[PDB]
C-alpha cells in the first residue's frame, strides 16, 4: 500500500516521518514483491517503523 | 529501418493447431525485449504474451493459460508461435511486437500482421 | 484486475485542443510507465506517446501529454487537429508481468 508514498510530492506516515524524497529527484526507484522469503508460516515481527 | 513480415494464417481449423512465424532484420536480435499481440477485427487491442532476449522467461494472459508456447532463436532471427485446442474467440489479426528496455517503456513496433480466422 | 478506463468517441471538433482522459480503478496508473498508442484502421499502428512524456523522431509536436495523481487519471492533448487520418487510440500500462490495453476511442470527423 506503502509503495506511492516513495515518490517526492505525496504526503504520509512513511513519507514524512520515515523516508522523504526531495522534490529535484533525478534517480529510479526499484520495487518487487517477496512475501515467502521475508514472512515464514508464523510471520515476521522483527520490523520496525 | 526495422522490417516485420509475418505469414502464419490462412486458414480454418477448429481446436486442432497451427503455427505462427514472425520474420525480422535490421537489428540485433538477443538483445531487447519482444512480445505477441493481436487484436478482434472491430474491437479493441489486447496483448498476448511475452519472452525475454534469451527465451527463460516466458509469460501469458490468464486467458490462454495452460496452452499456447512460444519459442525463439538467435541464428536465423526468426519468432515462432504455435497455439493449440482454438475456439471460436481467436478470430484476430497477430502482430509480432519487439521491446526496447522492457515491458515499461513501451511497444513501439508493430508488423502488418496476419488474418487469421478460425470455423467449426 | 488491473483494467483502464476512456472514452470511445471523442475529439470530434474542428481545429483546437481538447483532451482525452485514461484513468484506472484497480491501482495507481502513476507508479509505472503509461503510453498512447494510435492505429490506422486498415493497416499497421504506430505509437505516438512513450515515456509518458516524450515523443518519437518524425511525429510532430502537436501532441501533448500530462498525469494528475488527485484523479488518478492520463490526459492526451492534441493542439493542431489537423488533416490526420481517422483512427482509434488506447491507453496501456503494467501491473505485474502482465499487459493491459485500453478499450478504444475512435476518432472520425476532425
Known amino acids: 500500500d506503502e509503495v506511492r508514498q516513495i515518490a517526492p510530492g505525496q504526503t504520509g506516515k512513511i513519507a514524512d516521518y520515515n523516508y522523504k524524497l526531495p522534490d529535484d529527484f533525478t534517480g529510479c526507484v526499484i520495487a518487487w514483491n517477496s512475501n515467502n522469503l521475508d514472512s515464514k508460516v508464523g510471520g515476521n515481527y522483527n520490523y520496525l517503523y | 529501418e526495422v522490417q516485420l513480415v509475418e505469414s502464419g494464417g490462412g486458414l480454418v481449423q477448429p481446436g486442432g493447431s497451427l503455427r505462427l512465424s514472425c520474420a525480422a532484420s535490421?537489428?540485433?536480435?538477443?538483445?531487447?525485449?519482444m512480445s505477441w499481440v493481436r487484436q478482434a477485427p472491430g474491437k479493441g487491442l489486447e496483448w498476448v504474451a511475452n519472452?525475454?532476449?534469451?527465451?527463460?522467461?516466458?509469460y501469458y494472459v490468464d486467458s490462454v493459460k495452460g496452452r499456447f508456447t512460444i519459442s525463439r532463436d538467435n541464428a536465423k532471427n526468426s519468432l515462432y508461435l504455435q497455439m493449440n485446442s482454438l475456439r471460436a474467440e481467436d478470430t484476430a489479426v497477430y502482430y509480432c511486437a519487439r521491446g526496447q528496455l522492457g515491458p515499461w517503456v513501451g511497444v513501439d513496433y508493430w508488423g502488418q500482421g496476419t488474418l487469421v480466422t478460425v470455423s467449426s | 484486475n488491473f483494467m483502464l478506463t476512456q472514452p470511445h468517441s471523442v475529439s470530434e471538433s474542428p481545429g483546437k485542443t481538447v483532451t482525452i482522459s485514461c484513468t484506472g480503478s484497480?491501482?495507481?496508473?502513476?507508479?509505472?510507465?503509461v503510453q498512447w498508442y494510435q492505429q490506422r484502421p486498415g493497416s499497421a499502428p504506430t505509437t505516438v506517446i512513450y515515456?509518458?512524456?516524450?515523443?518519437p523522431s518524425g511525429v510532430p509536436d502537436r501532441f501533448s501529454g500530462s498525469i494528475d495523481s488527485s484523479s488518478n487519471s492520463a490526459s492526451l492533448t492534441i493542439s493542431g487537429l489537423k488533416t490526420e487520418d481517422e483512427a482509434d487510440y488506447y491507453c496501456?500500462?503494467?501491473?505485474?508481468?502482465?499487459?493491459?490495453f485500453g478499450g478504444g476511442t475512435q476518432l472520425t470527423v476532425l
Open positions: 515515456e509518458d512524456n516524450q515523443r
Open positions: 496501456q500500462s503494467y501491473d505485474s508481468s502482465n499487459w493491459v
Open positions: 519472452i525475454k532476449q534469451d527465451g527463460s522467461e516466458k
Open positions: 484497480s491501482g495507481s496508473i502513476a507508479s509505472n510507465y
Open positions: 535490421g537489428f540485433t536480435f538477443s538483445s531487447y525485449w
